[PDB]
Amino acid sequence: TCPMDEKLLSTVLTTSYSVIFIVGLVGNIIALYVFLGIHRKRNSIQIYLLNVAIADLLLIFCLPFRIMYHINQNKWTLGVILCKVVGTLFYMNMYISIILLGFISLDRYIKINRSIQQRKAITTKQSIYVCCIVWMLALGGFLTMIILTLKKGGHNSTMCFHYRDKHNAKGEAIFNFILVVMFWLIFLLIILSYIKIGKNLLRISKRRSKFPNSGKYATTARNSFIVLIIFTICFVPYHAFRFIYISSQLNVSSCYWKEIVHKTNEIMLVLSSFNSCLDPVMYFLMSSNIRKIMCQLL
Ligand SMILES: CCOC[C@H](COC(=O)CCc1ccccc1OCc1cccc(Oc2ccccc2)c1)OP(=O)(O)OC[C@H](N)C(=O)O
């Protein structure tokens, strides 16, 4: 455990996480207000996005502990219990957000590309069913893993969010490895969905059957590509490097690899958490009614 300099890393992480925290807080507050205050009725996609907003708001509420830890002296003043609570809660919220974004991709694909008329907008029932299942499965994993870590593991210290060996705890490592591959499957589904949606909207706009609103389809096709690219840049490099993280952490090696691996992991955490603040903004910007409201109000 080489105690290497991280003051510049601490400062850059503190600044990045503070900006992400404030932007995500304001964005998720606005998203909750619009999904509750002015949205009387919900469809499957809107319920999905409300749950994404709740997960992102929980990750944003998790962030201030991280910024305080990084800014104070890069040491954790409080107990290991809160360290474990925050560390597990941040990751569970992140993966809930990822899963629900994959479901938003999927139902957008089935609703736009292949649907002919409608499904009478009764897909909401299965939407809350899937949302409840995912939240219950996340909460169960949260409780079991935290209750195992607090008692079974004797590694209690005054340092948090740091690099640790997984010789004592290999279940956490294998569960993280499974999380990465399921995230990659979700990302492949997301990219397929959004490429197909964009191509369908471009061909529909290119046919130009009716002159009115023949240019909004091109805008919607562009928006699909934009949201797919934002998701990619936010999440892909992180889970690309998490493989090297696990490979280095599950075997004995010189700490010289460890500092650069830890620094890369933290930088990728910054990009991943930035999606939390970005997600509410894309809904407001890509919605024609909300965009016009923003344009006329400003
Ligand atoms: C105990 C400290 O945890 C935080 C971190 C280590 O994080 C991991 O190894 C990944 C997260 C993880 C993996 C395996 C099991 C539970 C995990 O915690 C989150 C979680 C909870 C519940 C469910 C769940 O998976 C879901 C699956 C399906 C649906 C919804 C959720 C995930 O350690 P630390 O804070 O020290 O940070 C180390 C390092 N800086 C860094 O960033 O990894």
Segments making up each domain of the chain, as ranges: 7-297
Residues 6+ apart with CB under 8 A from 139: none
Method: cryo-EM
Alpha-carbon distance of 220 to 197, in angstroms, equals 9
Supply angle C-alpha 282, 234, 254, rounded to 5.
Answer: 165
Closest residue by Cα to residue 198 from 226, 214, 222: 222
User: By three-state DSSP, how is residue 117 classified?
Assistant: coil
Expressed in angstroms and rounded, the spacing between residue 91 Cα and the centre of ligand 1 is 5
Cα 242 to chain centroid distance, Å, stands at 15
Choose which residue among 170, 179, 180, 247 to substitute to test ligand 1 binding: the one with the highest number of ligand atoms within 8 A of its C-beta: 179
CB count in 10 Å sphere of residue 201: 22
Which ranges constitute the DSSP H helices of 122-169? 124-152
Alpha-carbon distance of 247 to 241, in angstroms, equals 10
Expressed in angstroms and rounded, the spacing between residue 188 Cα and the centre of ligand 1 is 22
The resolution of the experimental structure, rounded to one decimal in Å, is 3.1
Closest residue by Cα to residue 61 from 4, 20, 98, 8: 20
Please indicate whether residue 177, judged by its CB atom, sits closer than 6 Å to ligand 1. Answer: no
Residues 6+ apart with CB under 8 A from 229: none
- CATH architecture of the domain formed by 7-297: Up-down Bundle (1.20)
Place of tokens 């104070």: 72
Expressed in angstroms and rounded, the spacing between residue 93 Cα and the centre of ligand 1 is 10
CB 202 within 8 A of CB 222: no
Q: Which atom of ligand 1 is nearest to the CA of 161?
A: 36
Cα distances (angstroms) measured from residue 57 to each of 114, 242, 293? 33, 24, 24
Alpha-carbon distance of 113 to 264, in angstroms, equals 38
Please indicate whether residue 269, judged by its CB atom, sits closer than 6 Å to ligand 1. Answer: yes
Annotate 158-186 with b (16+ C-beta within 10 A) or e (fewer): eebbebeeeeebeebbeeeeebbeebeeb
Q: How many helices (H) and strands (E) does the chain have?
A: 8, 0
Closest residue by Cα to residue 100 from 160, 50, 150, 170: 50
